[PDB]
Design a protein around this ligand. Structure first.
Ligand SMILES: Cc1cc2c(ncn2C2(C)CN(C(=O)c3ccn(CC4CCN([C@H]5C=CCCCC5)CC4)c3)C2)c(N)n1
Ligand SMILES: [Zn+2]
Ligand SMILES: [Zn+2]
Ligand SMILES: [Zn+2]
Length: 428
């Protein structure tokens, strides 16, 4: 189905989505209800488990007191999926630690037993039809799937009937590369879901669509004019980084290399890796070393985001920046990576001033490096606005919040609950 769209074979790629009618900028292509979903553990007090709405003072689950809901209606409708974790959270207590993947694969198995037939989440692609890339996964990723399986058994023993090891390996591999992360208006991680039809769409570093969420509902809107017969492209990755960096990430998770206009021309590559205009210009050899150092420290930081302290993480950001500053211009995407990373640590530690100072340095190069309609730009203006408003800068506040609404009206749509919320912030 899906009015004015069709599944097809995209040459040189595979299964894709194609427009059959035109779509102007801001037009809703389709909506895909969540086949399976979960709210992340760290967002448990702030958000409803069933619809993901952000509210303070949510009703608690009487049994576990770990799940929070808008009303009894969200609580009752959530129970089929919550019963998988409700009694095991009480039994295991603070030891209850299944990974978000294990948590999601559990809901998938539950949806397979209650609704074995094609769901409205599966109008053009089925979960069972998902790519698993099992032939391509290393020993590390296969060991984590074995680990995931043991965790599923250890934490969901009492509420599920499990298929054999081989069936569960395929499913865990499938979820790993097909699972969607859901973010809020600020790009903060909210949870994980299965959107079978959204997963049909192929990748481009110049996308003509963006995926946003209305609670657990995924929404696909046009960010470029789409003509009948043109293929529908979303971006699988973060479009801030140069071509090699994007293709390295693409190969890592989806084992394919990109061939779009941006990957071909590499026009934004020189500007993304901006170099200081020194009287003695740094040598190509020195430019090479700083790019490697940066890519190395980016990996070092992600790993450190597990064991090192927020004040330790900041030292890495600050010293990495200071080191890179020898060759890299402040608009360089590697500098910007660490500025963003320290902003997140500042927002974490509630250093609203430190965060605001990062954002201010981040936003002009962001609108220069990302496309016009980009969730990273809108969420950065939204974060700047909210911080400005919090620190008594109303003129700079309304200015940044309006700039967020501008992009967001096109991505999230003019009637989105987010736009209203932000408007209430300017008005009241
Ligand atoms: C050569 C080529 C092939 C291309 C392609 N474009 C898509 N192809 C495929 C046919 C190959 N595919 C896969 O290997 C492949 C595996 C799982 N999937 C589906 C995934 C669903 C989840 N999203 C993520 C997106 C955003 C952030 C949150 C995390 C979730 C990522 C996608 C695609 C699709 C392109 N430009 N070139
Ligand atoms: Zn609710
Ligand atoms: Zn409960
Ligand atoms: Zn590309």
């Amino acid at each position: 189905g899906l009015g004015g769209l069709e599944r097809f074979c995209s040459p040189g790629k595979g299964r894709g989505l194609r427009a059959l009618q035109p779509f102007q900028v801001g037009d809703l292509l389709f909506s895909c209800p969540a086949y399976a979903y979960v709210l992340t553990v760290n967002e448990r007090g702030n958000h409803c488990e069933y619809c993901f709405t952000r509210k303070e003072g949510l009703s608690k689950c009487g049994r576990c007191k770990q799940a929070f809901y808008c009303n009894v209606e969200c609580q009752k409708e959530d129970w089929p999926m919550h019963k998988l974790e409700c009694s095991p959270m009480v039994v295991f207590g603070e030891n209850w630690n299944p990974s978000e993947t294990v948590r999601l694969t559990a809901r998938i198995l539950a949806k397979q037993k209650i609704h074995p037939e094609r769901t409205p989440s599966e109008k053009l692609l089925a979960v069972k039809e998902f790519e698993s890339h099992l032939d391509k996964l290393d020993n590390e990723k296969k060991d984590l799937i074995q680990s995931d399986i043991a965790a599923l058994h250890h934490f969901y023993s009492k509420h599920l009937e499990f298929p054999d090891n081989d069936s569960l390996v395929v499913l865990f591999a499938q979820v790993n590369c097909n699972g969607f992360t859901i973010e809020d208006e600020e790009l903060s991680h909210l949870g994980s879901a299965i959107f079978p039809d959204v997963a049909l769409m192929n990748h481009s570093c110049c996308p003509n669509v963006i995926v946003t969420y209305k609670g657990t509902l995924a929404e696909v809107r046009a960010v470029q004019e789409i003509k009948p017969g043109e293929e529908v492209f979303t971006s699988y990755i973060d479009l801030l980084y140069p071509t090699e960096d994007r293709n390295d990430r693409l190969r890592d998770s989806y084992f394919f290399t990109c061939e779009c206009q941006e990957c071909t021309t590499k026009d934004k590559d020189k500007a993304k890796v901006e170099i200081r205009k020194l009287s003695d210009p740094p040598k190509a050899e020195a430019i090479r070393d700083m790019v490697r150092y940066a890519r190395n420290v980016i990996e070092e930081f992600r790993r450190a985001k597990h064991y090192k302290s927020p004040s330790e993480l900041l030292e890495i950001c600050e010293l990495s920046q200071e080191k890179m500053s020898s060759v890299f211009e402040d608009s360089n995407v590697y500098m910007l990576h660490m500025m963003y990373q320290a902003m997140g640590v500042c927002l974490y530690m509630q250093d609203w001033e430190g965060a605001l100072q990062y954002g201010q340095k981040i936003i002009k190069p962001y609108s220069k490096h990302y496309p016009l309609y980009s969730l990273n730009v809108a969420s950065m203006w939204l974060k700047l606005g909210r911080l400005y408003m919090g620190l008594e800068h109303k003129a700079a506040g309304e200015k940044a919040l309006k700039k967020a609404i501008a992009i967001m009206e096109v991505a999230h749509g003019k009637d989105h609950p987010y736009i209203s919320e932000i408007k209430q912030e300017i008005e009241s």
